[PDB]
């Protein structure tokens, strides 16, 4: 209505006129007013006025919150100490107290670093718990620990909405927009409320992120207390890293209450369900071994047929197609074909001894060295195959234990903080053989042993490989694959200053500066650190044409989750190294049609290194439209690397470190075929 009767009531500054006029404003305050509260120019005198002064503060914060104010709205409430499903409380509490306490917690959170804001935050916490509008009062009260008592104060019955919604979007925006320590608060407090609640597998992902030994204990006594089994053993062994399965088998071997978690703690019970169920319900066609094993020649496509042959591990015909197939094969193919028996015998532990024994202690050194490589690939928890490769260990020039050191130390790194493998690896790195893959599989071995360690120890292991890395400045491939293992030890954390320690004791000529930028690659697994994204764009134009490839190749690891920002204008540039950066930065994801388009444009190229590098990620990202790119390569080629690599693309076609290390080691294929002898022993495949 008109302001004729009530307009001359706010002008008198008398106490009774306020103590009866203000209750009328609380009565008519159900919808605020008839208009946008144009009475500011008349109540700004009441601003100076003060019996029921808390009501004057309430109406004052009501009108100042009604039109506009940045700091003066929550002052009448922090001084008021409010004591005096409708529309009134919804309007003055929900939105006005939402933005009100939001800007109070923002101003008091950014300006100063008492308890009045905590009382306001708990009061609004309870009132909005009554309002029952989730994720909005939550999405505003994220930045104010108080979040622990907030979640344990709120997570009592509402589990699906706060867990699913709050944990989903707050976890996504907690790895995207929230820094590390508050994410650690998400991990600990989520361990609390999720420990008191159900849905153990999400707490198991909280063990994939926490990597704590208590979570697996409480979830094994609680998952053991709450009665399938082999399946949660399967993804139990998949989600766990290198540390907590060794520690898990030592604490379960310390308790030995049932030994079923000891049985599930190893690779045996993750493979005994899969192999028979896979051979039974699936039937692969024989035209791939029969044809892809027939169009091979030139002693390289036949190697691609040893890899496609290694795809089997149903049909074991091409495996058992007589003998002399390895005898006709050359060294580059004697090692790969020697490891083919290891790729095809991932299961059948007892049969592996009687299948590889025929090639053990043979006449050719590479047959038995690749046979020990096979013995290391076939198993990872049996540990009863290492002895006739750890025994000798004494060549110092060449006595078949350097190649057996390649296959056995690499396969042992795949299947090995074990002290009595590194006490023996000390003369391995200290040997300094001219063979690149000695320090290659050594740094990759101890590196894959040191993944997820105690925050990346900087002991005399990586200090020793750094001193002996800078021992001699020859064969820079050593400087290309030693930062592989160095980064494998630096991997697992981003905030560590150990990368700056490498910036202290490592910085030198651009060789060890490329080592330092590799430590920069693997020491930034990913967080909200866009400073390294603008720094990435800044150092993106460096003259050195390899730290662009690796330091810019880190893109697929840094933003591996938010895949909407990963596509950029890297393909629109003119440097072929950048085209390689995007081409490798595609990844092994589900392979949407946009990625297939990026391979439809990146595929057509003239350089054999890029045309050789495109089918790897093209066929890794798609594991209908599978045979079209193969026909495209048949139309382009019809060199040797394109044909062997396209048959290897027939192999590929049809957050753990095990799926990250192999291809990152494979990023140095632009060299002699010695690297292609380590290409055949990748473990990132599924």
């Amino acid at each position: 209505r008109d302001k004729a009767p009530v307009q001359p009531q706010q002008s008198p500054a008398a106490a009774p006129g306020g103590t009866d006029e203000k209750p009328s404003g609380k009565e008519r305050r159900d919808a605020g007013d008839k208009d946008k509260e144009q009475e500011l120019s008349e109540e700004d005198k009441q601003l100076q006025d003060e019996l029921y002064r808390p009501a004057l503060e309430e109406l004052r914060r009501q009108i100042r919150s009604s039109t506009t104010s940045m700091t003066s709205v929550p002052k009448p409430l922090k001084f008021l100490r409010p004591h005096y499903n409708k529309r009134f409380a919804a309007d003055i509490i929900s939105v006005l107290a939402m933005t009100m306490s939001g800007e109070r917690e923002c101003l008091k959170y950014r300006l100063v670093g008492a308890g009045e804001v905590a009382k306001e935050w708990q009061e609004l916490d309870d009132a909005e718990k009554v309002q029952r509008e989730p994720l909005l009062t939550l999405v505003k009260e994220i930045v104010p620990l108080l979040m622990e008592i907030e979640q344990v104060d709120m997570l009592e019955k509402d589990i699906d909405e706060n867990a699913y919604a709050k944990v989903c979007l707050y976890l996504t925006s907690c790895v995207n927009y929230v820094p590390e320590p508050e994410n650690s608060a998400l991990l600990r407090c989520a361990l609390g409320v999720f420990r008191k609640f159900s849905r153990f597998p999400e707490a198991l992902r909280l063990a994939l992120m926490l990597n704590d030994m208590e979570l697996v204990e409480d979830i094994f006594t609680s998952c053991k207390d709450v009665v399938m089994l082999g399946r949660h053993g399967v993804f139990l062994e998949l989600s766990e890293d290198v540390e907590e399965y060794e520690d898990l088998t030592e604490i379960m071997s310390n308790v030995q209450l049932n030994s079923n978690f000891l049985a599930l703690a190893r690779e045996l019970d993750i493979m005994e369900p899969k192999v028979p169920d896979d051979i039974y319900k699936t039937h692969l066609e024989n035209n791939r071994f029969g044809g892809s094993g027939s169009q091979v020649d030139s002693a390289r496509m036949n190697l691609a047929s040893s890899f496609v042959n290694g795809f089997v591990n149903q049909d074991k015909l091409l495996t058992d197609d007589g003998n002399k197939w390895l005898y006709k094969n050359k060294d580059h193919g004697m090692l790969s074909a020697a490891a083919s028996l290891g790729m095809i015998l991932l299961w059948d532990v007892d049969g592996g001894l009687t299948q590889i024994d025929k090639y053990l202690y043979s006449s050719e050194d590479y047959i038995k060295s690749g046979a020990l490589l096979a013995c290391g690939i076939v198993n990872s928890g049996v540990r009863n195959e290492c002895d006739p490769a750890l025994a000798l260990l004494s060549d110092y020039v060449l006595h078949n234990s350097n190649t057996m050191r390649l296959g056995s130390i690499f396969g042992l790194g795949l299947a090995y903080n074990r002290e009595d493998v590194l006490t023996l690896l000390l003369p391995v790195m200290g040997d300094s053989k001219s063979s690149m893959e000695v320090a290659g599989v050594t740094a990759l071995a101890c590196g894959m042993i040191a993944v997820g360690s105690c925050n990346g120890d900087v002991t005399s292991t990586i200090l020793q490989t750094i001193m002996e890395k800078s021992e001699t400045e020859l064969k820079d491939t050593y400087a290309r694959w030693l930062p592989l293992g160095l980064g494998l030890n630096h991997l697992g954390k981003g905030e560590a200053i150990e990368a700056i320690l490498a910036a202290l004791e490592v910085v030198s000529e651009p060789f060890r500066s490329f080592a330092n930028t590799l430590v920069d690659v693997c020491a930034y697994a990913g967080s909200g650190n866009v400073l390294k994204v603008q720094q990435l764009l800044h150092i993106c134009s460096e003259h050195f044409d390899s730290k662009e490839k690796e330091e810019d190749k880190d893109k697929k690891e840094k933003k591996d989750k938010d895949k909407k920002e990963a596509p950029a204008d890297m393909g629109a540039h003119q440097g072929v190294a950048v085209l390689g950066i995007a081409l490798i930065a595609m990844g092994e994801e589900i392979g949407a049609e946009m990625a297939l388009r990026t391979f439809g444009h990146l595929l057509r190229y003239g350089e054999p290194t890029l045309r050789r590098a495109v089918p790897l990620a093209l066929a890794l990202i798609s594991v209908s439209h599978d045979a079209d790119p193969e026909v495209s390569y048949n139309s382009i080629f019809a060199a040797r690397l394109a044909a062997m690599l396209r048959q290897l693309a027939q192999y590929h076609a049809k957050k753990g470190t095990l799926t990250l290390c192999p291809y990152h080691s494979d990023r140095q294929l632009m060299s002699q075929v010695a690297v292609a002898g380590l290409l055949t022993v990748l473990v990132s495949f599924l």
């Binding site: 066609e285 209908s624 439209h625 045979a627 079209d628 026909v631």
Partner: protein, 330 residues
């Protein structure tokens, strides 16, 4: 920089726009013009020579006609096919489940689920040819939309693209054959086949040449061609044996029940009132396709949306039905 800005003498004032005929492996190509001047000069930079697709307009000069570069130029190719994946699947329409599983089973067996296709050893890479009496893209695109779920698609609507220009010939069919060659996992869809129904002497020879190149005399199993016309009597009997060789089916008359199902599908997502009857809607119609009922569902949702409401009343849907009653009678 100077080597990039030194070839400006060739692309300067003495410059012309010619028409290239073909590219010779001897690095000297043959061009043409209004009088057909054939000049062969060794190629230069700025040219691609692979994606150039000879037979188009290129850049010439008043000089000895050394090719200094190329200039690309066809908007009609863009409106040929759609590159999106519509959500309309084979399970969104009913009544013709056998009629849709005949084409789904016909062209979804090659290149997909191949154990019933490559083990037999037949490979008839010709595909079925259908025809819809209502047509207007609704029935023929509602049958062809089954292949559009997860696959590359190729669409050709109307014979106007041949008749809207001079008699260039089957070169456009060769463009569809090379883009289909580079896009083998696709489905060729020819819609609104009215070449002979709409010089006229050249239409018959480019249609018989369309039958020649469509037969695939030199190519193996590469793509499944699905043709779709409106009247089966317009096509000559010669376009059958070299054309439809796999299978064909007939479409029933959409009088009351097929229009009731089309009305249900077009009114499944929308919200209508309780008093909205169906007998008058399936009674007032007479030989109508789905484009006009979709048009009155669109203007009915917008007209009812004028009052900021999503519910379509009966009087407003009859007021929109007057557009159906008038349009077919006009």
């Amino acid at each position: 920089e100077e080597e990039r800005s030194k070839v400006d003498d060739l692309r300067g004032t003495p410059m012309s726009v010619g028409t290239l005929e073909e590219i010779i492996d001897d690095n000297h190509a043959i061009v043409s013009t209004s009088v057909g001047s054939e000049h062969y000069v060794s190629i230069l930079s700025f040219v691609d020579k692979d994606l150039l697709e000879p037979g188009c307009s290129v850049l010439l000069n008043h000089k000895v006609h050394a090719v200094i570069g190329v200039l690309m130029d066809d908007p009609l190719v863009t409106v040929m096919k759609v590159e999106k994946a519509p959500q309309e699947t084979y399970a969104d329409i009913g009544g013709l489940d056998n009629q849709i599983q005949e084409i789904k089973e016909s062209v979804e067996l090659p290149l997909t689920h191949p154990e019933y296709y490559e083990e037999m050893g037949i490979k008839p890479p010709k595909g079925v040819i259908l025809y819809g009496p209502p047509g207007t893209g609704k029935t023929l695109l509602a049958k062809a939309v089954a292949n559009q779920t997860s696959a590359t698609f190729l669409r050709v609507v109307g014979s106007e693209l041949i008749q809207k220009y001079l008699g260039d010939g089957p070169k456009l069919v060769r463009e569809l054959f090379r883009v289909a060659e580079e896009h083998a996992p696709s489905i060729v869809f020819i819609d609104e086949i009215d070449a002979i129904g709409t010089g006229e002497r050249e239409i018959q020879r480019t249609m018989l040449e369309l039958l020649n190149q469509l037969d695939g005399f030199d190519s193996r199993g590469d793509v499944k061609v699905i043709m779709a016309t409106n009247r089966i009597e317009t096509l000559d009997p010669a376009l059958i044996r070299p054309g439809r060789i796999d299978r064909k089916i007939e479409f029933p008359l959409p009088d009351e029940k097929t229009k009731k199902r089309i009305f249900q599908i077009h009114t499944s997502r929308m919200t209508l009132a309780d008093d909205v009857t169906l007998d008058d809607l399936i009674m007032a119609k007479d030989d109508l396709s789905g484009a006009d009922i979709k048009a009155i569902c669109t203007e009915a949702g917008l007209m009812a949306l004028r009052e900021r409401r999503m519910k379509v009343t009966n009087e407003d849907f009859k007021k929109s039905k007057e557009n159906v009653l008038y349009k077919k009678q006009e």
